[PDB]
Design a protein around this ligand. Structure first.
Ligand SMILES: Nc1ncnc2c1ncn2[C@@H]1O[C@H](COP(=O)(O)O)[C@@H](OP(=O)(O)O)[C@H]1O
Ligand code: NA
Length: 258
């Protein structure tokens, strides 16, 4: 029967949310929705009967999952999800905030090519190095800011933060933690993955629902544009104090600042 997701991948955008979901779909005890529901942010009015109807069917002991990257930054998401159930497990796939802003910009550049440069959107006042905190690309990277709001409705024990960089260099190691966090037996492993030279990322030997090798679509693995390293330095400096706070809240250093 259909059940409401006991675990959600709530963020972040461009941290590697699809990759993680697609890898978790290999486990025999994970059933997940395909496309981003965007329920708790854009379609909450439709109610939990609509939400439950999107979910796949599951046997007993199977875990239902979804991923919507905007939840982590959408203001009302914590209260609403906890309202669904106070026990929901939450996962955040985090990434270097600066690489994430560039990946975010690169996604838009693949849709509206005429947009200004990353360096002009970066600043409100280049002459003074004042960064546009209103720009969504900047704001999503301040993980500690959004994390504080989630901890008003969830114990940090029910929240797992996955390394987006380590998801690319050692998918089997990272997914070992995620399986422990969801009470799933360690099944996903190194043999499930393989590196495709021409893609640049790990791929699945057999995806869920397929017997063939499966890499991620053309929408994942984009070539970023070349960015002024002075802006990158000024962007790493902006995030540094926020990254340090995030490390303390999570008890883990994700290596973005050394
Ligand atoms: N095996 C894999 N194949 C492709 N992209 C992967 C990947 N593992 C992680 N990713 C990353 O996942 C990002 C997308 O995150 P999301 O699905 O949350 O939007 C990609 O951003 P880039 O295109 O900048 O490289 C890519 O870096
Ligand atoms: Na974008």
């Amino acid at each position: 029967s259909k059940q409401l997701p006991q675990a959600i991948i709530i963020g972040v955008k461009k941290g590697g949310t699809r990759a993680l979901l697609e890898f978790l779909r290999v486990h025999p005890d994970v059933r997940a929705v395909g496309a981003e529901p965007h329920f708790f942010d854009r379609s909450y009015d439709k109610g939990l009967a609509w939400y439950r109807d999107l979910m796949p069917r599951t046997l007993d002991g199977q875990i239902t999952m979804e991923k919507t990257p905007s939840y982590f930054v959408t203001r009302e998401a914590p209260a609403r999800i906890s309202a669904m159930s106070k026990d929901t497990k939450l996962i955040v796939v985090v990434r270097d905030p600066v690489t994430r802003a560039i990946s975010d910009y690169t996604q838009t550049l693949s849709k509206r090519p005429d947009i200004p440069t990353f360096e002009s959107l970066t600043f409100k006042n280049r002459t003074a190095g004042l960064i546009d905190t209103s720009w969504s690309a900047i704001q999503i990277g301040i993980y500690a800011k959004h994390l504080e709001h989630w901890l008003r409705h969830f114990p940090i024990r029910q929240m797992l933060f996955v390394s987006g960089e380590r998801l690319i260099s050692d998918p089997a190691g990272e997914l070992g933690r995620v399986q422990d966090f969801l009470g799933l037996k360690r099944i996903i492993t190194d043999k499930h993955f393989y590196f495709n030279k021409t893609k640049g990322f790990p791929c699945l030997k057999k995806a869920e629902g397929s017997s063939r090798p499966h890499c991620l679509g053309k929408t994942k693995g984009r070539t970023h544009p070349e960015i002024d390293r002075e802006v990158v330095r000024r962007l790493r400096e902006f995030y540094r104090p926020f990254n340090l706070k995030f490390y303390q809240m999570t008890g883990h250093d994700f290596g973005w600042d050394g």
